[PDB]
Amino acid sequence: PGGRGEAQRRKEREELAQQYEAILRECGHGRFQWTLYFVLGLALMADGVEVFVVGFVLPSAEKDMCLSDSNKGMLGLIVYLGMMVGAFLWGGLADRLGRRQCLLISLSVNSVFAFFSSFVQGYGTFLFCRLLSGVGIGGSIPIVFSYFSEFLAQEKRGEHLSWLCMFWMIGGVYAAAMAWAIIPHYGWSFQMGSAYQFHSWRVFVLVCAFPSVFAIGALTTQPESPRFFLENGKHDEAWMVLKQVHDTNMRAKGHPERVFSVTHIKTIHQEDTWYQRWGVRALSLGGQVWGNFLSCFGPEYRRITLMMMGVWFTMSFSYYGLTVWFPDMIRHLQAVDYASRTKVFPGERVEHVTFNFTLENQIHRGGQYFNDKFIGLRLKSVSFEDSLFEECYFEDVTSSNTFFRNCTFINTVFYNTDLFEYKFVNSRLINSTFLHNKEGCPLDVTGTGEGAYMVYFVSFLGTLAVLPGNIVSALLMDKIGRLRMLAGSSVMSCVSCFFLSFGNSESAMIALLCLFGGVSIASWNALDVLTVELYPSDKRTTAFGFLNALCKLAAVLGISIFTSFVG
Amino acid sequence: PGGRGEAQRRKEREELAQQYEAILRECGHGRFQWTLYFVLGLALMADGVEVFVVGFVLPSAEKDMCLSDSNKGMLGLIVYLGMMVGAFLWGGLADRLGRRQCLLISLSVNSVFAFFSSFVQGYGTFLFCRLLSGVGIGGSIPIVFSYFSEFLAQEKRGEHLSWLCMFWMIGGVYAAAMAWAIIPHYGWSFQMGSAYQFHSWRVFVLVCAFPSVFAIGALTTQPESPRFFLENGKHDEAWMVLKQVHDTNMRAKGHPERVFSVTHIKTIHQEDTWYQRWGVRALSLGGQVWGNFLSCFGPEYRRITLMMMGVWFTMSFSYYGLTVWFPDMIRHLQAVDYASRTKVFPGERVEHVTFNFTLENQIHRGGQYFNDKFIGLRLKSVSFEDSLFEECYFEDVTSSNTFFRNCTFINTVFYNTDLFEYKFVNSRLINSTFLHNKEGCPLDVTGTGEGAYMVYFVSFLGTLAVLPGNIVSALLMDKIGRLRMLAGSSVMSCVSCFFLSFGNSESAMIALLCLFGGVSIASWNALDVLTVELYPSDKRTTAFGFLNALCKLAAVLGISIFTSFVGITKAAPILFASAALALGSSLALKLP
Numbered sequence A: 001p002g003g004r005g006e007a008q009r010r011k012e013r014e015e016l017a018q019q020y021e022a023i024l025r026e027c028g029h030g031r032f033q034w035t036l037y038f039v040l041g042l043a044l045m046a047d048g049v050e051v052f053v054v055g056f057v058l059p060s061a062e063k064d065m066c067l068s069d070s071n072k073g074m075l076g077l078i079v080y081l082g083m084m085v086g087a088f089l090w091g092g093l094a095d096r097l098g099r100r101q102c103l104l105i106s107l108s109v110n111s112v113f114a115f116f117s118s119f120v121q122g123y124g125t126f127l128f129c130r131l132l133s134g135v136g137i138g139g140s141i142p143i144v145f146s147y148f149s150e151f152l153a154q155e156k157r158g159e160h161l162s163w164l165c166m167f168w169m170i171g172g173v174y175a176a177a178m179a180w181a182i183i184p185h186y187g188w189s190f191q192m193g194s195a196y197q198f199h200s201w202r203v204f205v206l207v208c209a210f211p212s213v214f215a216i217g218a219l220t221t222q223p224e225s226p227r228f229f230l231e232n233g234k235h236d237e238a239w240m241v242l243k244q245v246h247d248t249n250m251r252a253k254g255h256p257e258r259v260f261s262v263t264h265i266k267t268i269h270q271e272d273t274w275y276q277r278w279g280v281r282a283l284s285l286g287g288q289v290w291g292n293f294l295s296c297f298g299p300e301y302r303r304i305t306l307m308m309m310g311v312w313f314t315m316s317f318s319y320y321g322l323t324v325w326f327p328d329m330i331r332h333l334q335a336v337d338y339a340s341r342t343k344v345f346p347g348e349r350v351e352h353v354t355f356n357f358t359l360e361n362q363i364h365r366g367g368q369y370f371n372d373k374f375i376g377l378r379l380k381s382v383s384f385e386d387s388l389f390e391e392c393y394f395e396d397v398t399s400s401n402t403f404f405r406n407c408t409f410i411n412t413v414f415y416n417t418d419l420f421e422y423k424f425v426n427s428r429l430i431n432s433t434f435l436h437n438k439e440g441c442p443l444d445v446t447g448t449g450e451g452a453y454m455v456y457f458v459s460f461l462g463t464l465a466v467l468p469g470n471i472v473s474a475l476l477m478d479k480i481g482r483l484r485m486l487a488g489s490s491v492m493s494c495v496s497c498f499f500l501s502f503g504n505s506e507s508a509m510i511a512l513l514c515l516f517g518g519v520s521i522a523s524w525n526a527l528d529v530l531t532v533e534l535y536p537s538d539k540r541t542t543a544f545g546f547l548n549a550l551c552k553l554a555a556v557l558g559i560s561i562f563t564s565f566v567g
Numbered sequence B: 001p002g003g004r005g006e007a008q009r010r011k012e013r014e015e016l017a018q019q020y021e022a023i024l025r026e027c028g029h030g031r032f033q034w035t036l037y038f039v040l041g042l043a044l045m046a047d048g049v050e051v052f053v054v055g056f057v058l059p060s061a062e063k064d065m066c067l068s069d070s071n072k073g074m075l076g077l078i079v080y081l082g083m084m085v086g087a088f089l090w091g092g093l094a095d096r097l098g099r100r101q102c103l104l105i106s107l108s109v110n111s112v113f114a115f116f117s118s119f120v121q122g123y124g125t126f127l128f129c130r131l132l133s134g135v136g137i138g139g140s141i142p143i144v145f146s147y148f149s150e151f152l153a154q155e156k157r158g159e160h161l162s163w164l165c166m167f168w169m170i171g172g173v174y175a176a177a178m179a180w181a182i183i184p185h186y187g188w189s190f191q192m193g194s195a196y197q198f199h200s201w202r203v204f205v206l207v208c209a210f211p212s213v214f215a216i217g218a219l220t221t222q223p224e225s226p227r228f229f230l231e232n233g234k235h236d237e238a239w240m241v242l243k244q245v246h247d248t249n250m251r252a253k254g255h256p257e258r259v260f261s262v263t264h265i266k267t268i269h270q271e272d273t274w275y276q277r278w279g280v281r282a283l284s285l286g287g288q289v290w291g292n293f294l295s296c297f298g299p300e301y302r303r304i305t306l307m308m309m310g311v312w313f314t315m316s317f318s319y320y321g322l323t324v325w326f327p328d329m330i331r332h333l334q335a336v337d338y339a340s341r342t343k344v345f346p347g348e349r350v351e352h353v354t355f356n357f358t359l360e361n362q363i364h365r366g367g368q369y370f371n372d373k374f375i376g377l378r379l380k381s382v383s384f385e386d387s388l389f390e391e392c393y394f395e396d397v398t399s400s401n402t403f404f405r406n407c408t409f410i411n412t413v414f415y416n417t418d419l420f421e422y423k424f425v426n427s428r429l430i431n432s433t434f435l436h437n438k439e440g441c442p443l444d445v446t447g448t449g450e451g452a453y454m455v456y457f458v459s460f461l462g463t464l465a466v467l468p469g470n471i472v473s474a475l476l477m478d479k480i481g482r483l484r485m486l487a488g489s490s491v492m493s494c495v496s497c498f499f500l501s502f503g504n505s506e507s508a509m510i511a512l513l514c515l516f517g518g519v520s521i522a523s524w525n526a527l528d529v530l531t532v533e534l535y536p537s538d539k540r541t542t543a544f545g546f547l548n549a550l551c552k553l554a555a556v557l558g559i560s561i562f563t564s565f566v567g568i569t570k571a572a573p574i575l576f577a578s579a580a581l582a583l584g585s586s587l588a589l590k591l592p
Helices: A002-027 A031-064 A069-097 A099-117 A123-137 A140-151 A157-162 A165-182 A201-219 A226-232 A236-252 A257-270 A274-296 A302-339 A449-479 A484-501 A508-534 A540-565 B002-027 B031-055 B075-097 B099-119 B123-138 B141-149 B157-162 B164-182 B200-207 B210-219 B226-232 B235-252 B256-267 B274-296 B302-340 B449-477 B485-501 B506-534 B537-564 B572-583
Strands: A343-345 A362-364 A379-384 A399-404 B362-365 B382-385 B388-390 B408-410
Touching: A002 A226, A002 A236, A002 A257, A031 A069, A031 A099, A031 A123, A031 A140, A031 A157, A031 A165, A031 A201, A031 A236, A031 A302, A031 A449, A069 A099, A069 A123, A069 A140, A069 A274, A069 A540, A099 A123, A099 A140, A099 A201, A140 A157, A140 A226, A140 A508, A140 A540, A157 A449, A157 A508, A165 A201, A165 A449, A165 A508, A226 A236, A236 A257, A274 A540, A302 A449, A302 A508, A302 A540, A449 A484, A449 A508, A449 B449, A449 B485, A449 B506, A484 A508, A484 B449, A508 A540, A508 B506, B002 B226, B002 B235, B002 B256, B031 B075, B031 B099, B031 B123, B031 B141, B031 B164, B031 B210, B031 B235, B031 B302, B075 B099, B075 B123, B075 B141, B075 B274, B075 B537, B099 B123, B099 B141, B099 B200, B099 B210, B141 B157, B141 B164, B141 B506, B141 B537, B157 B164, B157 B506, B164 B200, B164 B449, B164 B506, B226 B235, B226 B537, B235 B256, B274 B537, B302 B449, B302 B485, B302 B506, B302 B537, B302 B572, B449 B506, B485 B506, B485 B572, B506 B537, B537 B572
Parallel strands: A343 A362, A362 A379, A379 A399, B362 B382, B388 B408
Antiparallel strands: none
C-alpha cells in the first residue's frame, strides 16, 4: 500500500498545484506582487549589508581591540559558520514555523543583536554577537524567495522573481556608501558623559543594521502566505489572506470575489512545565524535519538534488570569489598606490635655520637634528627610527598619527603633540617627557583609517558598477530562452578584449571585477529562479536552506584551503 | 466639408502608408541595406568626431594661439548653439527639400568649414569656422535617422536602427586615436615649411575631417528616400530606386524576375534673376515650415509632442554626462594633480660639471645661487620667485611655461626665449635685458604636453573600452520588451545621476564612466526609434530635429550652469536631474 499511497499523494500535490494556480490566475492584476517584491527588497538589502560587512569591514574594524591575525582573519569564517548553521536550522524549520513569523523573527533577532553589539566591549563578545547576527541573517534568502514565489503567479514567475537582484545590490551599494562616509568622519560620534573615544565603526554597525528595522517595520503589516496554510490544510486563514490580496484588485477595477470565494471553499472541501514542553515539541519538530530531509533525499529527487549540488559546487567558485577573494588583490593594489606618495626623510636640517613648513607622511631613517630648535612645526604620520634629535625644544607643534619603533631622543621636548608612552614599542625611553602635552592615545586603527576609507570608496564604486553589468545580463537570461549560450560567449569575448585593450591603467582590474561580478550575480539569480520552478513547494524551503548551507560551506572551504595551498 | 475632407485625407495617408510598407516588405533585406548602413555610419562617424572635438579638445584653446580666458569659454557653447540652429533649420528643410539633399548639404558644409578651421589663424575666424561646422553637423542625426527609416519596415527596423550607435561611438574612438597620436608627438606633425610653421593642433583638426569628406564621397551614390518621392509626385524615380534595391536584395536571396511585375503593379497606383527666385523660395519655405510647426502642436499630435519633449529631457542628462561632464572632470583632476606635483630646490649647484640634462617642473622659492659659468641650461615648465641670480647668462636656451615674479636677475641675459612683459611683473632687475628671442605671437609648444598626453590617452582608452561594452549592451537591448526600453532608459538615467554624484577619483571615474557609457549609449537610441515610429514622414524630420534641438538646449544650459557657477554646485544638477526623472513617472510609460 506504500506505492499506492505515494501515488495518491503525488496526485494530491498535482491537483493542489493546479488549484493553486487557479487562484493565482483568478487574482487578476499583479500589482500586489509589486508591493510584496518592494517590501521584501528590504530583507534582501539587509542580507546584502550583512554579507558586505562580513566580507569587507569586519577584518579591519577590530583594530580598536588589536586582535591577532588568526583572530581577525578567521573571524570571517566563524561568522560564515554562524550564518550557515542558521541557514541549515531555519531553512529546515521554515516548512513548520510559519514563513511570515519566521521571517519577522529572523529579521528582529539579528537587528536587536546588532543594536546591542554596536556599543558593547569584549574581544570574544564581538565574535559571539556577530555569530548571533549571522545566525539571524543567514536564513533571509531561502525564506524570502519561498515567501515571494508563493505569491507570484506561474506565468510571471521568471521575470518578476529574478528581478530581486536589484534590492540586494542596492543594499550592498548603500552599505558601501555608509562605510565610506561614517568611518573617516568623527563628527557622528559627538556625545556627552561617555569618555570612550571609540572609532566610528561602532556607529557604522548601527547604521548598517538600521535597514533591518526598516524591513521589520515594512513587514509588520503584511499578511501571511496562503500556500503554507493550504499545505497545513487550514481553510479560513488562507481565505482571509487571499481576500486581502484580492482587495487590491477590488480597489483597482473590481472583480467577482464572491465567485472566487466559491472556488476557494470548493478546493477547501477538496483539500481537507514550560521548560519541559519546549523540548517536548522541539524533539517532534526535529524528528519531522529529519523525516522531511530523508524524504527529499529519496529516489524521487535524488538525481535532481545531486545535479544541483554539483551545479552550485561549480557555481560557488564565483560566490566566494566575489565575496572574499579579490579583497586581497584590491587591498594590495591600494597599498602599492599609497606607497607611491610616501617618502623617506634622511634629514633636511640646516645649520641655524627655522623650519615651519607643514610636512606629512614621513618615515625617518638617519634624520638626526644637530642642535636644532623649531616652533610651530606641523608633523603628520610621524615615524621616527634612528633619527635622534638633540636640544630640540619644540613648542606649539601640533601633531597627529604618531607611532614610534626603534627610536631615541636626547633633550627633546614635545608640546601639543599626540605622542604617548603606550605607543613606544622596542625603544628606550630617553627624555620622554610629555608634561602638559595633549593627551595621546594608542594608535590602534588610526594608522589604518587612511587606507580604510579609500578602500571603502573603491569597494563602493565596484559594487555600484556591478549594477549596470547586472541589468543587461539579467535581461539576457530572462528573455533569450534556449540559445543564451551564443550571447554569453559574445559577452565573455567582448569583456576579454575589453580589459585586454583597457589594461593600460590600474582601473582595468576594477572593470574586470565589476563585469565578472555582474555576470556571476545574474547567474546566481538565474539558478535561484530555475530552482524555484523545479522543486515542489512542499519541501522547497528546506531545500533552499540546505542549498544555501552547502554554498556557504563551499565558500568558506575555498579560502580555507587557498590559505594553505598557495602562499 | 472641411472635417470630411480632413478625414478623407487622413484615411488616404494611412492607406498609402500601408501600401508603402507593403512595397518595402516586397524589397526585403540584403546588401543594399547594410551598404546604406555603412554609408550613413560614415556620417555618424563625422558627427561623433565633431562632438569629440567640441568636448574633449576644449583645452587646445588655451594651448595654442593664447588669448584671454574670457574668450576661451565660448568654444564649447557657440558650437552647441550652432547645432541648435542646424537641427531646427535643416530638419525643416529636409521635410520640404528632401532628406538626401539636406543631408548632403549638411555634410558638405561641415567638411568645408572643418577644412577651413585648420588653416586659419585668427580666433574670431576660428570661432565662425567652428560655428558653421557645428551648424552643418547638427543636421546629421535627425535627417540620417529619417532618411534611413524610410528604407526599412517593422520586420528589422529596431535592430538595424539600433546598430547606428556603433558608428556614432567609433567616430569618437577614431577622433581620440588621432588626438593621442598627433597632439603630443610633434614628429608626425611635419615642419616642412621653413616660412610656414605647422602645429600638431591644426594638423589634428584637419585630419579629423576625413570621415566627413569620406561620407560625402561615399554617400552621393545613394538615392533619395522613396517616401518623399511618393509625397511630392516623383513616382518614376521611386519605382526605379525600389527596383534597384529589389535587384540588390535578390542576388542574396530569391529570384529577381518574378517580383518585377508584382512590384510594378504595387507601385503603379501613384503616377502622373537671383533676387526674385531667392525671394520666392524664401517666401514658400518659411511659410511652409511655419505652417508645419504650428500644425505639429495641433490636437492630432499635441499630447505626443508634449510627452516627447519631457522624454527627451530625460535623455539630455545622460548625453551631458557622456559628452561634456567626463572630459571637464578629467581635465580638472589632471590640473589639480599637476598643481599638487611640484618640485622645489635651493639650486642646481655642481662642481665643474656641465649641466646638460633635461629637467622640468622647477618651482623655486627663496633660492640663492652661487655665481658660476652656467652652460647647458634648459628651461621647460620652469618658474622662479624670490630668487636672485648673478652671472648666469646662457646662449640659445629653450623656454616653455615660464612665469617669473618677485625675482631679480643680475647680469643674466637669456636668448631664444618665449618671455614677454605680461609674465614678468612686479620685480626688480639690474643689468638684465632679454633680447635675441622669438617674441611675437605666443605659441605654447609642448605646453602641458605630458599632461595633454595623459588626457588624450585616457580619453582614447575610455572610448575604445566603451566600444565592446557598447556592442554587448546594444545586442542585449533588443531582448528587452519594447514597451520597457523606456523604463530601462530611466533606470540608466538614475544610475547616471548616481555615478555623477559619486565620482571623485581618476581611475574610479574612468572605469565607472566607461561601464556606464556602454549601456547608456545603447539605450539612447530607444528614444530615437520611438520618435521615428510615431511621427509621420511628412512630420518626421521637423519634429525629430525640434526634439534633438531641445536636447541640445538642455545640454547647452547645463554647460551654462557649469560656466556661471561650478565647484560649490557640483551636485545641484544631479539633484535637478533626479527630480526631473522622478517627475515623469507616468509619461515615460504611457505609450498610445
